[PDB]
């Protein structure tokens, strides 16, 4: 049970940065909730951690970059086998980071990433639209966080204090918008 | 010109009821701006009108239903030829209105409708989704109002007032959302 493997983030912090209002400003931070497993989806969570970084460049200090460096040294300490990573990230990847995660997934065919985004990041600038396409073109499975993944993220990475998940009104309103957007953007 | 054929609506009313923030309810009414034309769209508009209806049932007082009765009476006064109707309605259609318009478009292969919605109405509830999916059958061309269609509507149906149309913030961002949602819902 990964609640001990990580240093769970604050409830007032989660409700703020994982709010899925598609157009939102005032959140300068992107929170990545990481989780490593084997080619199995049914066994134990093998390792887990929470990265965070601020959005202004350099992109070398972004929570998807902190992951890529961490997972490089971590892959060394464990045996060569197929891994299944999955992210619960607050904002979608930026443009430079999407290129890094693509070069990574390309070199290393044993890992297969799955990113759940709470919000799509600059879904209107066409640079960021091809960033999402770059990822799904490298093998990364891109999805929108729905009620289950918001809940499953609360249980696993928060000071839940046994408290159960409290969903805001307009969650599936925003979900239907964001899924359909990600659906159109990835379409080719 | 058609600013003369109708009873132009108020400027403060148009920005109010045609604002395209995908999520809205503080809005009790639905506004339908109609326009009938010939086979050739490069000709002038034959007639035009503004309907109104409150959003609560029965659907008999919905602005797309007042049209269906009005257009039946108007059809008689002219010779039979092919009409190209186009709506600029603020909310998308409800479920029962969509049945009317589908069966209506079915009786008369000479009419071809084009509906421009400013917002999708209850785009998350699953029946209101096959609601748009009906009109898509029986031929209705479904589209989202982008800036051009908002502008063209101000010109034709709004008491211009000698002040220019000022488009509201995030209009083409909201367009991306609603355009993506509608697109996915119609293939679904
Ligand atoms: Zn980045
Ligand atoms: Zn109706």
Author numbering:
A (entry chain C), B (entry chain A): 4 to 138, 143 to 195
Task: Provide text from the study.
APOBEC3s (A3s) are deoxycytidine deaminases that have important roles in mammalian innate immune responses. Members of this family catalyze the conversion of cytosine into uracil on single-stranded DNA (ssDNA) and restrict retroviral replication and endogenous retroelements. Among all the A3s, A3G is most known for being a potent restriction factor against HIV-1. Similar to hA3G-CD1, rA3G-CD1 forms oligomers, binds to ssDNA/RNA strongly, and is catalytically inactive.
We obtained two crystal forms of the rA3G-CD1 protein under different crystallization conditions, and determined the structures to 2 Å (CD1-1) in one crystal form and 2.9 Å (CD1-2) in the other crystal form, each in different space groups and with different crystal packing interactions. However, these two structures are essentially the same, with a Cα r.m.s. deviation of about 0.54 Å, indicating that the structures from the two different crystal forms, including the surface loops, are not affected by different crystal packing or buffer conditions. Since purified rA3G-CD1 exists primarily as a dimer in solution, we attempted to identify the dimerization interface. Examination of the monomer–monomer interfaces present in the two crystal forms revealed 10 molecular interfaces. Interestingly, only one interface is shared between the two different crystal forms, which has the largest contact surface area of ∼726 Å2 (compared to other non-shared interfaces ranging from 664 to 88 Å2), suggesting that this shared interface is the dimer interface. The interactions of this shared interface are mediated through residues coming from loop-7 and α6 of the two subunits, arranged in a tail–tail (or C–C terminus) configuration. Several residues centred around L184 on α6 from each subunit pack with each other, while W127 on loop-7 of one CD1 subunit packs with the aliphatic side-chain of K180 on α6 of another CD1 subunit. The loop-7 residue F126 is buried within the interfaces, forming the hydrophobic stacking interactions between loop-7 and α6.
